[PDB]
Amino acid sequence: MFTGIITDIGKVDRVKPLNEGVLLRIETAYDPETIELGASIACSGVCLTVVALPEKGSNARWFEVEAWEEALRLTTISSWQSGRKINLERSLKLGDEMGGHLVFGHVDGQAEIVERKDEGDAVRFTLRAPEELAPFIAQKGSVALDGTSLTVNGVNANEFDVLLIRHSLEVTTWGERKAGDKVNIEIDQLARYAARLAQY
Amino acid sequence: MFTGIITDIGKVDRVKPLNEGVLLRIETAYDPETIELGASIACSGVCLTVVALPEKGSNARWFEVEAWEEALRLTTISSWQSGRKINLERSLKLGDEMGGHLVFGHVDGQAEIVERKDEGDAVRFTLRAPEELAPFIAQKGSVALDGTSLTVNGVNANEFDVLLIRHSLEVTTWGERKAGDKVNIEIDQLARYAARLAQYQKLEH
Amino acid sequence: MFTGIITDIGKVDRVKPLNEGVLLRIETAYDPETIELGASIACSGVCLTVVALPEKGSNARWFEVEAWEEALRLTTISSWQSGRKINLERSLKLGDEMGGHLVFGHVDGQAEIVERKDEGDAVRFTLRAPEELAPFIAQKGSVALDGTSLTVNGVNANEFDVLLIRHSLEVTTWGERKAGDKVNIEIDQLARYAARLAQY
Numbered sequence A, C: 001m002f003t004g005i006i007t008d009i010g011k012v013d014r015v016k017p018l019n020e021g022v023l024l025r026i027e028t029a030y031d032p033e034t035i036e037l038g039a040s041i042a043c044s045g046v047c048l049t050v051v052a053l054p055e056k057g058s059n060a061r062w063f064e065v066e067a068w069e070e071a072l073r074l075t076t077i078s079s080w081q082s083g084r085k086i087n088l089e090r091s092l093k094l095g096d097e098m099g100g101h102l103v104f105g106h107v108d109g110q111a112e113i114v115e116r117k118d119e120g121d122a123v124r125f126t127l128r129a130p131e132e133l134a135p136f137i138a139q140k141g142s143v144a145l146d147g148t149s150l151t152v153n154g155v156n157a158n159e160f161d162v163l164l165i166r167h168s169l170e171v172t173t174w175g176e177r178k179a180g181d182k183v184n185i186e187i188d189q190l191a192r193y194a195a196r197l198a199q200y
Numbered sequence B: 001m002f003t004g005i006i007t008d009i010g011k012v013d014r015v016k017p018l019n020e021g022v023l024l025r026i027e028t029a030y031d032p033e034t035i036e037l038g039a040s041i042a043c044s045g046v047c048l049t050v051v052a053l054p055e056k057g058s059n060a061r062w063f064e065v066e067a068w069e070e071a072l073r074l075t076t077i078s079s080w081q082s083g084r085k086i087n088l089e090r091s092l093k094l095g096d097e098m099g100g101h102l103v104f105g106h107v108d109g110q111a112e113i114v115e116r117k118d119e120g121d122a123v124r125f126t127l128r129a130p131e132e133l134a135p136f137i138a139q140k141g142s143v144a145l146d147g148t149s150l151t152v153n154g155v156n157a158n159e160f161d162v163l164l165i166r167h168s169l170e171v172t173t174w175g176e177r178k179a180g181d182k183v184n185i186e187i188d189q190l191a192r193y194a195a196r197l198a199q200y201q202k203l204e205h
Ligand SMILES: O=c1[nH]c(NC[C@H](O)[C@H](O)[C@H](O)CO)c([N+](=O)[O-])c(=O)[nH]1
Pocket: A040, A045, A046, A047, A048, A049, A050, A065, A066, A067, A068, A069, A070, A071, A074, A075, A105, A106, A107, A108, B140, B151, B165
């Protein structure tokens, strides 16, 4: 589990093909001495488990993860190539506060940025989400876009807007986002359960 | 408390029947110096208390647990024989990373594997959950199956699917699971809070 | 921080009025050499700081704490008189085992015991929760009642059930608890998250 508070901008070093999957090497500012093997890291909102770390003595700062069929089909990982900057977040530690938005790294699909407009030192992004996600939006709660916890402001069916503040643009990949870009979308976990309960 | 991140594959050494209970001796890779009597260890998702350990200074690596009436009835434990491989997880300590979700080790019942499909080096498992548990299983939600924190992908009535990654298949008992097998199911406690608010709001109006 | 695993039954020796507060002197079985000035101790679920200790060379086994407006308003502290037995728990350190659940020692309010019923070695307590907390008390959920980590056995409107085992009744103030008694209530992190989302 995560909080959607991005702590690093990672970089895709290499993409290696696996049997119906990809091996991703991600460059990070995180100390590999603080990353245990098997740790869960949210990579642009995708929960992935660390499978390899640099050799003892090596000055390299990377971690390796494996993205399989569900992650490839639904997430932006399908388009990831060497040089791609990605949002990073470490798992929530027992004792730390949960905050206003829990993020599990279970992305529903890809939302598309249709408009980017500057509003002072902040940037308003207008997005379109897959049709099936529309009833979860309009509820105007919090959403995880590329692993970033964001408040849903205006809504028109499957179209919605988010306001990215100066700090968020600086410390996340949102500073380089533009119209046409695909982002990972994760609907609020409690809202998922509430909607599933409503079916019965 | 647990997170559903399996850290060892234990092996059932001894199965001893007691008065409405069973004494289980589990061989483990865990350091005996890290385990004290009264410790809680999730055994294939079942929270069990350590009742016996090897002698002070011994190199033997095992721990004993007792599964009573509730555990024997709701869980897969009733079928556990000597040689059975089980998923193991230590209780969360202050400051430990919660890699999965909040897992309590309180198994709600048993889910049956209806299909095992290869997805390259990953494996898709289709499961049938008890009817009562179905409203708590949501698409892209969390579930603890044999104590393993997993993302629920598709859901159709009381049937749902999960994708077991290569890493999980290698470090858990999921690598040997097949169609027809019964697994321990613990629905996400977060779903109970959604059900509670909906129950309170219904009683209100 | 705390886990809800009570380690001592303290006794209130003195209740002294302060300017906009209350000073409490608590007798404890804790080793006096292990209690340092400024240490956090959960007193019937209320996180309070040690303000005074016995002087150099004294054999006395007490500690002093100060309760302010928030604690006096929300907790049972306002009703505490000399001779009152209270649950005690020392603060956790990074890496400590957590036998109960995550307890911050920040009580949300007071729950009232409406019924006490024997069930073999165990005792079933029925409690009335404040209306603001009631929609966030769910079955199988963890709750801190008088600082004791307990599982919610059943729910019904504003009422909920907890089952107190023989050991818990023996080592905590729950053994002397009766119908009509007010207890401190602290909802867990999941309940707090659900309450925060409903508030938003
Ligand atoms: O393919 C993977 N999926 C994993 N999880 C599920 C994944 O997050 C979802 O399939 C994705 O978010 C799309 O829903 C992984 N871990 O959890 O560690 C992992 O390492 N690899």
